[PDB]
Amino acid sequence: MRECISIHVGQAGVQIGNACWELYCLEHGIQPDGQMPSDKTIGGGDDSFNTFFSETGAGKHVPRAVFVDLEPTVVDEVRTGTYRQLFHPEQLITGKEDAANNYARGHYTIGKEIVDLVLDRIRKLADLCTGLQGFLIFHSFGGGTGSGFASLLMERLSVDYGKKSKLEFAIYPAPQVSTAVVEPYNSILTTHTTLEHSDCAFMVDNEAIYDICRRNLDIERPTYTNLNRLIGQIVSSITASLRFDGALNVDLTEFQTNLVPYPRIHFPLATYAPVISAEKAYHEQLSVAEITNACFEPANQMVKCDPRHGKYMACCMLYRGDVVPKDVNAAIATIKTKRTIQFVDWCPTGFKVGINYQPPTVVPGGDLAKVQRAVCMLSNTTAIAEAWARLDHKFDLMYAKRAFVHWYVGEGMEEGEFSEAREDLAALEKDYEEVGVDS
Amino acid sequence: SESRGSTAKLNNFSRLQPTLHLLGLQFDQNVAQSIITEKPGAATKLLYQLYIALQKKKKTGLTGLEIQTMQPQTNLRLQTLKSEAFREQRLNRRRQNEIMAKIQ
Amino acid sequence: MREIVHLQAGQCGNQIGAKFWEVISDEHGIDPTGTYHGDSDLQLERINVYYNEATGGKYVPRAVLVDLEPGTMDSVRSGPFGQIFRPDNFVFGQSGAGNNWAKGHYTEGAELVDSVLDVVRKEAESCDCLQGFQLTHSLGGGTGSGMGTLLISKIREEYPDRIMNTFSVVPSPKVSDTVVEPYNATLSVHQLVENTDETYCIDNEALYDICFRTLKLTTPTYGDLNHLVSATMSGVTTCLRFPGQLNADLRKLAVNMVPFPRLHFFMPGFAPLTSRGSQQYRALTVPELTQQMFDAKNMMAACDPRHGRYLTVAAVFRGRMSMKEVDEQMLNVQNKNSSYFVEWIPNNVKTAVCDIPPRGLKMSATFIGNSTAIQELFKRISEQFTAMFRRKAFLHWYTGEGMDEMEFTEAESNMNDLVSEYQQYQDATAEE
C-alpha cells in the first residue's frame, strides 16, 4: 500500500532522518527497543504503522530508510546513541574519504566508488515493499556529501524508476549568513541536476528559522535540535494522510500532480503554522482563519522573500487536527477577497482540503506545545526567483577570475559545466519572469 | 416590435424604460397599467412630459447626452434598469395574464 | 422483478452512497447485523428493489464500489453498517488517481475495468428484468469522474435500454478542491452530454449556505451534506419504492422534463429545511411547502433561477394531504409568476403525491425542476477553461500520459455550442 523509502545523505540528512524517525516512534508509541514491552498500561499503537515501519513474525519494527554518509564520524555518533537497537548496521554505510563541501571529489573520485552497494541496498528495500509512490531524499546544497553523491545517485534512480515520484529536501545558502565559502559552487551544479532530472524540489534556509524562533519562541540560544524538530513536523504534516486517514485524504500523488504547473517550475513555498512555544500556546485563542492569514505573512515564511513582489501560480493547503470545514470555507472566502494577496488573471482559485482526524502530538523535552490543530501551506509564486538571481550574481562575481577553481580542474571535470549551469539558471530565471508576466 | 402579441410589447418596453430614465422621468406602474388596459390619460401624461422635455433639450443648449453633467444620474440607475426589468415582470404579474390566457 | 442496480464511484460518491444506504436501512427497519427489524407494511413487498433475497431473510445490498485507492474501503467498512455490504464489490486498485482524469481513465481504467464489468454483468444476469442504473459520484477528482463516465458509456453500449441517472457534484470557483478541476469538469461534461440520459447538479457551497442561514448548525460537516443528499435521493426514489395514489418512475420523469437530449441537467431540492428550535413551532400545510419549493432561498443552487425562465418543473410530494391544493397553487403561481416560466408551453409543473409518508417525518416532498440557471456556471467554466488553455498551464501532466490536446479543443467547441444553444433557447419568444 502507501509505503515510501527515505534517503538521508550527509550529516544534515542523517540528523533529519533521525529526528523524523524519533518523532514517528514517539507519535505512534513505538518503543526504542523495537518491540512492544507495554504489557501493563497501553498508550496507543493500534494503527497503520506499515507505511514507514515493518512488522516481523516476532513483533518487531524495522525502519525503512537509507543512512549513507562519506564521513564515518556521523555514523559513529549515531551508532553510540540510545536508538542503536532500532535500525540495522547494514543501513549505515561508513566511508574512508569524504567530500566535506566539495563536489568534484564526491562526484567523481569518491561517490563513484560506493555505487553498487547502495543500489543493492535500495533494491532490497524496494523488494521488501509492496506499494511504492515516492522517495524522501534528504541532503544539503552546502554539504559536498549531500551534493555530489546525491546527484550521482538520483541520476541513476531516475533512469531506474520513471514511474515513481522523486522528491527533494535540502537547505538553501542564505544570502546574509552562511557556514562555508564554496557553498554556491556546489549549489550551481546541484541545481541543474535537481531541475533537469527531478520532478519537485523544496528549498529552505536557516536564517528564517532563526528569525521565527527568536520572534515567537523567544530563545536567545538556539540549537540544531529545534530546527530538526521543525523540519520533522513539516515532513509529518505533509505526509499525514498516509499513515492515517481523514475526511479528505491527500496522498503524495494527489498534491504532487497539482503542485507542478510546469516541468521547469517545481519549487513550492512551504509554510508551517503555528510555530509557537508553550507560553505562546496557552493564552492565545487558535482558530483556522487567523492561522491561514498568518500563513501568507512573509515573516512566517522559511524563505526570505516578499510575496508582494510577485504573484501566485498554484496553492496547496493542508490541515492536521480537529478542523471544521466551515472555518476553512470562511477563510477561503476571506482570502479570495484580500487585495494584499496577489495572483494572476488566469487562476481565480485552486487549492486542496486535507482533513486529518489525528491531531499533532508533543514530545517530552521539546519546545512545541499541545495544539488542537495544525496547517501546512505549499504555494507557488514567482517572488522567490530573487534567490536564484542572487546566487547567479554571486557565481558570476566569483567566477570572473576563477577563485578556488584550480582544484576542481585538477580533480578532473569540465570547466564548461560552470558556463552550462550559468546559462541554464539564466534561462530558468527568464522562464520564471515570462510566467510571472500576465497579459 | 409593434405586433399585438404582448411579447413584442415587452421587447419594446424593455428598451423604452432606460430611455424614459435617461431623463429621470418616473416610468410608473400605473402608467403601464393604463397602457395595457387603455385608460386614457396616464401614458398620455408621461408622453407629454417627455414632449416638453424634448422642447427643453431644443430650447437653449446641450443634447440629452450632454445634459448628464448637471446632476450625476447613472450612480444607481445601473440597478434601476434591472429593477425596471423586474418590475416589467411585476407588471406581468397583473397585466400579461390576459395575454397569456390565450397562449396557455 | 423490477429492480434498480446501484453503482459507486469517487470517495465523495462512496461516502454519500454509504450514507444513503444507512438512511434507507434505518427508514425501512434494517438492523446493522443484516436481518430485518421493521414494523411497517410496504417495507416487505417492494423491498427487493435495492436488496436481494437470500436464506434466513437476510437481505443483501446491491451496490458496487469502484475506486483506485484502498484507503476508502477501510474507512467505509469500519462504520456501523460497513460490515453488511459485499466485500467482492469493493474493487480497488493500488495507485491513487492523483486528481487526474486522463491518467485515471487510461492507466487505471484498463486493467481494473474488467472486474467491475464482470461483477455488474453478473448482478444484471442475477435478476430477471431491470429499469436503470444509479451512479453517485463527483467531478472533483480522477476517481468519480475518471471512471464514472467510462462505466456509463460501457453500460449504455451493452444495454442501451436502461436509465442512466447520476448525481455528480458540480464545481464552484468560490469553493475549489482541485487546481485542474475545471479541466476535469470540462472533460466530464462532454461524456455527460454525449453518453448519459440525465444528470442532476450537486453543489456543496450552496448546501453549506443553506445549513448556515436556515438550519443554523453548530459545526456543519460532510455528514450533514451526505444526510441531505440521501434524503433527496429517498424522496426522488419513493415514487417507485413506496407506491401511492399517483405513482411515478424515473423514465417517465426523464422523458417528460427533458425537452432536448442535449439539455438533461436538473435542479434538485428538498423543502422542510428548518432549525432545531423551529421544529416544534411550524405549520404543516400546502402553501408553505409551495413557497419553500418556489423561492430561491431553499434551493441547493449556487446560482439564481430568477435570471432565466422555468423550463420543466416537477413537484413530488410524500404525504397524505389532498389533490386540489397543488393544482390551485401551481395555477395561481403561473398566473402571477408569469415572467418566470416559458410562456409558449403552459402547465410546466407536474403533480405527484406519495401517499406513504416517510419514517420519522410526516410531511416530506422534494423539488425536481430544470430552470434557466446553469447557464452562468457553464459560461464561467468555459471562461476559466479558455483562460488556462490559452498559455496551456498544467498541461504537461496530461500530455505525458499519451492523450493529445485536440481533445480540449473539441471539448471547448462542444461547450461553446451547448451554451450558445442554452442562451438562444433561454429567450424563447412566441413569434417574430
Side-chain angles (χ1 to χ4, degrees), chain C residues 34-346:
Chain C
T35 58
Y36 181 74
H37 277 64
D39 57 330
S40 180
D41 310 340
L42 281 83
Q43 293 181 353
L44 191 139
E45 179 184 359
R46 291 294 185 266
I47 191 167
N48 46 15
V49 175
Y50 296 152
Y51 294 153
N52 183 25
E53 182 36 30
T55 178
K58 297 180 297 181
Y59 298 92
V60 298
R62 186 177 299 268
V64 180
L65 187 135
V66 185
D67 56 328
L68 302 182
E69 189 68 21
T72 61
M73 61 79 71
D74 282 321
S75 60
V76 304
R77 184 176 303 274
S78 302
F81 295 87
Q83 66 282 351
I84 199 181
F85 293 93
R86 167 78 273 184
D88 293 331
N89 293 15
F90 292 82
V91 182
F92 57 92
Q94 301 291 338
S95 177
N99 302 304
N100 193 316
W101 185 94
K103 177 176 57 184
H105 177 244
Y106 182 76
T107 300
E108 289 82 13
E111 293 78 11
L112 197 60
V113 70
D114 305 328
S115 301
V116 298
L117 276 69
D118 295 329
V119 300
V120 301
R121 181 180 58 90
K122 181 179 181 179
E123 291 289 337
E125 190 69 25
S126 59
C127 180
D128 193 11
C129 185
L130 303 176
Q131 307 180 352
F133 298 88
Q134 172 55 55
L135 169 58
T136 59
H137 65 269
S138 58
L139 304 183
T143 53
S145 179
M147 284 73 74
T149 61
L150 174 59
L151 292 180
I152 290 300
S153 60
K154 289 301 181 181
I155 197 61
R156 183 170 188 166
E157 187 268 347
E158 297 178 0
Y159 295 151
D161 52 329
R162 300 297 170 87
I163 309 173
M164 283 73 74
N165 50 329
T166 180
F167 290 83
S168 62
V169 179
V170 297
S172 178
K174 273 72 57 177
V175 181
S176 176
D177 285 6
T178 311
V179 182
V180 297
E181 176 67 24
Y183 279 137
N184 303 331
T186 296
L187 294 178
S188 59
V189 163
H190 181 63
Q191 272 63 23
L192 290 179
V193 306
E194 287 297 332
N195 298 328
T196 301
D197 290 353
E198 59 178 356
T199 301
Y200 299 87
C201 303
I202 301 301
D203 183 76
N204 301 20
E205 181 180 358
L207 293 175
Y208 168 75
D209 191 13
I210 289 178
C211 76
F212 182 80
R213 74 186 172 182
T214 60
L215 279 76
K216 302 174 181 57
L217 303 179
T218 58
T219 183
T221 59
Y222 291 156
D224 299 325
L225 279 76
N226 293 15
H227 183 201
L228 269 295
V229 300
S230 306
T232 302
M233 271 325 278
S234 305
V236 166
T237 53
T238 190
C239 63
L240 286 175
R241 177 59 187 93
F242 293 151
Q245 199 278 336
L246 184 55
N247 62 91
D249 49 334
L250 305 180
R251 55 100 184 174
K252 171 57 181 54
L253 302 179
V255 166
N256 200 267
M257 283 73 74
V258 174
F260 303 95
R262 52 186 175 272
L263 296 190
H264 59 73
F265 293 90
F266 299 105
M267 186 65 204
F270 197 54
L273 277 296
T274 53
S275 63
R276 178 70 267 166
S278 56
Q279 300 290 155
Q280 65 279 16
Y281 305 108
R282 289 171 65 178
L284 278 297
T285 186
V286 182
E288 287 195 8
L289 293 180
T290 304
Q291 291 300 330
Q292 272 83 72
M293 296 176 193
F294 182 78
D295 69 327
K297 184 180 60 180
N298 189 273
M299 72 178 183
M300 61 80 71
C303 48
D304 187 10
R306 278 80 61 90
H307 302 171
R309 306 179 64 91
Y310 300 152
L311 306 177
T312 55
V313 180
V316 182
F317 295 90
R318 187 172 183 174
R320 184 190 297 102
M321 301 65 88
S322 184
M323 42 186 98
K324 179 174 65 66
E325 283 65 14
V326 180
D327 60 65
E328 69 90 10
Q329 281 291 340
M330 61 79 71
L331 177 61
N332 58 65
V333 175
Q334 291 184 175
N335 297 328
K336 299 176 178 182
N337 296 91
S338 178
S339 305
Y340 294 91
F341 67 100
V342 286
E343 57 92 25
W344 188 260
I345 297 96

